[PDB]
Amino acid sequence: MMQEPLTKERLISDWNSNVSVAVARTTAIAKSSDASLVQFLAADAAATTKSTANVLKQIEPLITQPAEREILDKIMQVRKTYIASRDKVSQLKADGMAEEAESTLINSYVPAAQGYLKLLGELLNLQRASLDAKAAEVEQIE
Amino acid sequence: MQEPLTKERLISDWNSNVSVAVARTTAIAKSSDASLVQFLAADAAATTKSTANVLKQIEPLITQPAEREILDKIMQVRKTYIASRDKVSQLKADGMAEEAESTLINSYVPAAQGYLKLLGELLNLQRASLDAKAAEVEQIESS
């Protein structure tokens, strides 16, 4: 019972950490004049990506509420926009197109990452609220 | 239940901050751009302040021998981690790219790995306590 929202809270926390890491890395890539940084960080980026893939596969079978499914649907859509803009920033920086990379970071990547993190926060708060309610019942009702 | 849950959430935020800082410092050390240090200074300071606030909240809640022992070890290694992080940033800002990369590999990465390993152990202490309590609840409700 309780372990359901507990497990989902932990998985979503890992996911949120992965996105925060990826945002810091993409920000550093976009602000560095070094066109080679993308390739230097490719292995780290791949580890972050695969970590999130693992989280997603674990979260999917645990989704039990319509609200969770709607939020997750929105997350996956926003995530598509985020991935496209992240990849565009990396491509432009690798090609030395610093100005266009900045335009993309500001107009596309930042809003997508912010929406991504906001929706992850909503799903996380959903789990935390369910778990907090059950924990309060267990403590008080005893 | 609320005690280990609060600690688990605070430690999760802490761990996220450390992972972000490690990614940022790695990017700084691998970039040929000496200016990245200054460009990311505000973000790095915000990560630092976030962890400081987490520590202020978690310290009074860490009361039992095992968690206190792990926390003491974390703070010890964290001293080395901070020193090496600051060294990496300083060498990069000073144009000592080669020395900054060497410091990243020989000093910063080992400290960061020990820091993250001990944070993971503290987090797992909280998670194991919560798992045990939740399982006890499921047992009671099953009878």
Residue numbers in the entry:
A (entry chain B): 57 to 198
B (entry chain A): 58 to 200
Give the exact sentences the study uses for this entry.
Previously, we reported that a transmembrane chemoreceptor MCP2201 in a gammaproteobacterium Comamonas testosteroni CNB-1 recognizes several tricarboxylic acid (TCA) cycle intermediates and mediates a positive chemotactic response towards these compounds. We also identified a binding site for an attractant citrate in the MCP2201 LBD, which, similarly to Tar-LBD and Tsr-LBD, adopts a four-helix bundle fold. Here, we identified malate as a repellent recognized by the MCP2201 chemoreceptor in a bacterium Comamonas testosteroni and showed that it binds to the same site as an attractant citrate. We found that malate and citrate affect the oligomerization state of the ligand-binding domain in opposing way.
Here, we determined the three-dimensional structure of MCP2201-LBD in complex with the repellent malate at 1.8 Å resolution and found a malate-bound MCP2201-LBD dimer in the asymmetric unit, similar to that observed in ligand-free MCP2201-LBD. Malate was bound at an internal pocket surrounded by all 4 helices, which overlaps with the citrate-binding pocket. Specifically, residue R135 interacts with 1′-carboxyl group of malate via hydrogen bonds along with the potential interaction between negative and positive charges. Residue T108 forms a hydrogen bond with the 2′-hydroxyl group of malate. Residues T105, Y138, and R142 form hydrogen bonds with the 4′-carboxyl group. The significant difference between malate- and citrate-binding pockets was that the ligand’s carboxyl group (coordinated by residues Y138 and R142 in both cases) forms a hydrogen bond with T105 in case of malate, but in case of citrate, this residue is not involved in ligand binding, but instead 2 other residues, R81 and T104, form hydrogen bonds with the ligand. In contrast, the malate-bound MCP2201-LBDs primarily formed dimers (apparent molecular mass of 34 kDa). Residues S69, N72, and S73 were involved in a water-mediated hydrogen bond network at the malate-bound dimer interface, but not in the ligand-free dimer interface. The free energies of malate-bound (−14.5 kcal/mol) and ligand-free (−10.8 kcal/mol) dimer formation calculated by PISA support a more stable malate-bound dimer than the ligand-free one. We propose that the malate binding induces the displacement of helices α1, modifies the dimeric interface, increases the dimer formation, and then alters the orientation of the helix α4 C-terminus (via the dimeric interface interaction between helix α1 in one subunit and α4 in the other subunit).
